Design a protein around this ligand. Structure first.
Ligand code: CA
Ligand code: CA
Ligand code: CA
Ligand code: CA
Ligand code: CA
Ligand code: CA
Lengths: 173, 72, 98, 72, 72, 49, 49
């Protein structure tokens, strides 16, 4: 009894009954990607002027990313390194107001491309939550101190330059 | 839900009108036959019987045969 | 055989069952499906072996669960020293510090 | 409810840090190691693996071995 | 929840893109490959197929082969 | 056989069982209903030697 | 306890007694030799012996 519906749940994702559109499935996958973060984060983003766009034009011939400063063209990605602008698929232009540009991809079966979107979203709402008083919040500073005390937390979260300068100044802060 | 009379795991409209099996990243997908997308990729168009669990009456279903989940 | 009188007996293997504690009535019951041949090759691969003849000059063999460093499940066992192995395996003690 | 991965009837914190078994009135109590109390009572301090049902891979639990619910 | 097609205990994206097994106190944890943490400790980086319960078609799943929960 | 002394021993097949892990108590149990001849032709067709 | 004071025939009984180095047997009640002889074979004391 339950074995037959167990089989029907083990192929519940495999069969697709009505498709009929290749570039429409990417739209649905971007939408149910972006709905996974809670709505309060999106309210926080839209409060200081946050715009989120779904394009399929890749981000070199895009008109609103056409001419921009070169140091903004090479920022830190989710690793800490830099990346050519001919291969990016997300960007948060924040010159006069923050504007998020997400290229549509199959985000439901690509969990590594699905993480750079979340990294740029957390990059967008960062300075709101870190600096509540135009300076770093002391609860977060105690957190930074207690994470730098450990080592697995230190080489997970911190970049390499921040890790070496955190001991060059000997937690001077 | 969707009708599936023969209980092999593939709906009856797809078995009558055509379907195909593709692998996308590393996951398989059984989808209906759209003649613009799947034709140029060299995919095969299958048809089966919506009433028979295996159209050739052997002990391997249509789903197992096209998907590779079979005795190798 | 009548000339040289040499005939010996080898032991190739031993079949035998295991008796486990039944938690309901406390009784110990022999499971005739499981045997000791599925168990001893798991003891022999995860344990260190110490043989000892300090009692009546007879070889007494014990096995102590030690850590295999290239296996994730086996690195969860507690660390075993040689001294604590001698203490809990045979009955060595330190009545003065030695 | 306390975590117990291996399902051997004894929690993982006690297996990693140390435990002992102690009859009190006529009933058996399994209890964590306390240096001020259990040392002078002549009680042994056990450690075992929180992810093996039987730390020596023999067919007797850690709980049955330390408690007495074993083949005598 | 997180998807798991072949029902072996590793999620699909971990099987496709990389994973490893680390032991932190006395508890093993199956984690995706982080090249800062796991490369300093000399861990191995595994990949396997998200739809076979055992990628080499032997009677031992990928989860048992990487976590040591196997015939020794 | 007394004249030429030629007698060899061919090995046509081998029957044997598989022992699988048991999640509830960690033991390893030989299932006497499944042999290796159901398994090993599936290894032989998906692998490279 | 083996006893042959009735018809000089050896009669063997067993009485549950406490093992002091096993926590399941330290829960059994305390057994004395007088009570063992009283409940196992049929000794008594009609006036104090
Ligand atoms: Ca069908
Ligand atoms: Ca059919
Ligand atoms: Ca245990
Ligand atoms: Ca436990
Ligand atoms: Ca899986
Ligand atoms: Ca797998």
């Amino acid at each position: 009894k339950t074995e037959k519906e167990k089989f029907k749940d083990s192929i519940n994702n495999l069969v697709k009954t009505e498709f009929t559109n290749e570039t429409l499935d990417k739209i649905q996958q971007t939408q149910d990607l972006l709905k996974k973060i809670p709505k309060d984060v999106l309210e926080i983003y839209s409060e200081l002027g946050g715009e989120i766009y779904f394009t399929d034009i890749d981000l070199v011939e895009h008109k609103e990313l056409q001419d921009l400063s070169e140091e903004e063209k090479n920022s830190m990605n989710s690793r800490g390194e830099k990346v050519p602008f001919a291969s990016r698929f997300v960007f948060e232009k924040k010159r006069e107001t923050p504007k998020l540009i997400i290229n549509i991809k199959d985000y439901a079966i690509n969990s590594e491309q699905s993480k750079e979107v979340y990294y740029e979203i957390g990059k967008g709402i960062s300075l709101d939550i870190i600096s509540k008083d135009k300076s770093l919040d002391p609860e977060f500073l105690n957190l930074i101190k207690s994470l730098s005390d450990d080592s697995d937390s230190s080489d997970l979260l911190f970049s390499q330059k921040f890790k070496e300068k955190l001991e060059l100044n000997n937690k001077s802060i | 839900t969707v009708p599936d009379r023969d209980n092999d795991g593939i709906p009856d409209s797809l078995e009558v009108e055509g379907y195909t099996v593709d692998v996308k990243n590393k996951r398989t997908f059984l989808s209906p036959w759209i003649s613009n997308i799947h034709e140029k990729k060299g995919l095969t168009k299958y048809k089966s019987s919506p009433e028979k669990w295996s159209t050739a009456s052997d002990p391997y279903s249509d789903f197992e045969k096209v998907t590779g989940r079979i005795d190798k | 055989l009548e000339k040289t009188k040499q005939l010996r007996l080898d032991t190739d293997q031993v079949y035998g069952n295991i008796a486990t504690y039944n938690f309901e009535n406390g009784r110990v019951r022999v499971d005739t499906g499981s045997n000791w041949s599925e168990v001893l090759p798991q003891i022999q691969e995860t344990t260190a072996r110490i043989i000892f003849n300090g009692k009546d000059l007879n070889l007494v063999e014990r096995r102590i669960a030690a850590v295999n460093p290239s296996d994730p499940l086996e690195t969860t066992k507690p660390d075993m020293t040689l001294k604590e192995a001698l203490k809990i395996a045979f009955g060595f003690n330190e009545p003065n510090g030695n």
